[PDB]
């Protein structure tokens, strides 16, 4: 059927535009990452990674 949208109709009957983003936060190799700058590796020392 139709979606006849006209300015006469009030709130709720006006068209609404939606976009959904689905993520994959799970244990797997990374493909998308945020804008951060990496550093050097240190070993044999109590550090935070």
């Amino acid at each position: 059927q139709s979606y006849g949208f006209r300015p006469t109709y009030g709130v709720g009957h006006q068209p609404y535009r939606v976009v959904v983003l689905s993520f994959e936060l799970l244990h797997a190799p990374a493909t998308v990452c945020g804008p951060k700058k990496s550093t050097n590796l240190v070993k044999n020392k109590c550090v935070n990674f």
């Binding site: 949208f5 006006q14 068209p15 609404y16 535009r17 939606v18 976009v19 689905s22 936060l25």
Partner: protein
């Protein structure tokens, strides 16, 4: 990361959620119960009229 794009009736905007049935959520588009991500909905009556 995935993005899905579509336009619907505003009254049915709340029906895009896990564990929701009705008309749009039973025959057109369905979301999983354990979905993680975001949704973004906004009015579009200015153009689609």
């Amino acid at each position: 990361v995935y993005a899905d794009s579509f336009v619907i009736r505003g009254n049915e905007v709340s029906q895009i959620a896990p564990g929701q049935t009705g008309n749009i959520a039973d025959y057109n588009y369905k979301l999983p119960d354990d979905f993680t991500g975001c949704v973004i909905a906004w009015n579009s009556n200015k153009l689609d009229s």
